[PDB]
């Protein structure tokens, strides 16, 4: 019987047309993204899309193997293999688009890098489907069989390049976030030490304590600036400045408070507002981290309230220092 024996071949032709459209669709998105109009969906951290990309990417690796294995054999099995791969790349493209958009319109250079990485996969799939067609029901020795295997590696090479780009993107997207977190743990360790019953390394004068307190002023303002700019470089600088400023203020506070010439109520008062200041400040940094994950106007206005809470303790801290003489 003349059962249709070019359906596999036919599926390859239809697949090639589909892949052409996806690439054209990714070029369009690169255009929008380059112009800065591919906006973030409020929050929707990159960490979410990363899983969907990776999951779909592993499915695409299986579809690659199925294509290679099924080029020799049934037309129907080849037709099925072609169709499956096109469905997967459609989905992979779409989830990568969402991941790139989740980086936000203020980082357009990285958005385009990400979309191109998946575009490269799309191109490699087109070549792979073309190679299976040329190899459709050919046996091992045939150069088309050689070419099919070679086409499939140039596909998986692209897939791993996509995965490498995703890893590089996410590290850069959180380098400041992860630095600020390191600072909050250091501050907590410092504050646990500050609050511990062990004495400070030495005593000091109100003037040493006072000069550290003023450091809080410059750091709070800086932190507020990083939360408003959301620039990872400002976040890095805030992390470094905040760690030193709070650590220093806690050291001098306890050293000044334990000075023999300080009355027990004034020592008590100084220690209390030292803790208060650090705690208010940790809540400010924690609000900064929330702002970095969903940088809308609402969260940023709330930075004002946190800055006031730190400032309120600073006033107490300065009056406590003066009362040590």
């Amino acid at each position: 019987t003349g059962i249709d024996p070019f359906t596999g071949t036919q599926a390859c032709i239809t697949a090639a047309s589909a892949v052409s459209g996806i690439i054209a669709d990714l070029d369009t998105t690169i255009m929008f993204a380059t112009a800065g109009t591919l906006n973030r969906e409020g929050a929707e951290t990159f960490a979410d899309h990363r899983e969907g990309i990776l999951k779909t990417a592993k499915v695409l690796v299986e579809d690659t193997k199925v294509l290679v294995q099924n080029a020799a054999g049934s037309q129907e099995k080849l037709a099925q293999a072609a169709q499956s791969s096109v469905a997967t790349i459609t989905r992979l493209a779409d989830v990568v688009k969402l991941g790139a958009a989740s980086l936000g319109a203020e980082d357009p250079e990285t958005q385009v890098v990400l979309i191109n990485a998946v575009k490269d996969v799309a191109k490699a799939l087109g070549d792979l489907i073309s190679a299976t067609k040329a190899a459709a029901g050919k046996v091992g020795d045939d150069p088309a069989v050689w070419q099919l295997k070679n086409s499939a590696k140039v596909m998986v090479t692209n897939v791993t390049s996509l995965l490498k780009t995703v890893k590089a993107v996410e590290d850069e997207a959180t380098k400041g976030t992860r630095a600020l977190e390191a600072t909050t743990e250091h501050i907590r360790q410092e504050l646990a030490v500050f609050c511990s019953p062990e004495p400070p390394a030495k005593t000091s004068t109100p003037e040493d304590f006072i000069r550290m307190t003023k450091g809080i002023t410059m750091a709070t303002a800086k932190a507020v600036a990083a939360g408003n700019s959301c620039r990872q470089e400002d976040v890095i600088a805030t992390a470094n400045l905040s760690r030193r400023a709070i650590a220093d203020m806690l050291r001098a506070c306890k050293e000044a408070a334990f000075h023999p010439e300080v009355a027990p109520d004034v020592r008590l008062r100084a220690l209390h507002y030292g803790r208060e200041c650090a705690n208010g400040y940790l809540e400010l940094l924690d609000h900064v981290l929330l702002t970095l994950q969903k940088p809308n106007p609402d969260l940023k206005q709330q930075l004002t309230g946190h800055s006031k809470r730190v400032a309120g303790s600073v006033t107490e801290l300065i009056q406590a220092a003066e009362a040590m003489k």
Binding site: R50, L54, K58, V61, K149, N150, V156, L163, V166, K167
Partner: peptide
Amino acid sequence: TLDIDQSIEQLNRLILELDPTFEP
């Protein structure tokens, strides 16, 4: 389950499986 650190390992080996110039 596998994360990107291990996937990129299995896939670099898979690139060599497919690679028809590479046959030890």
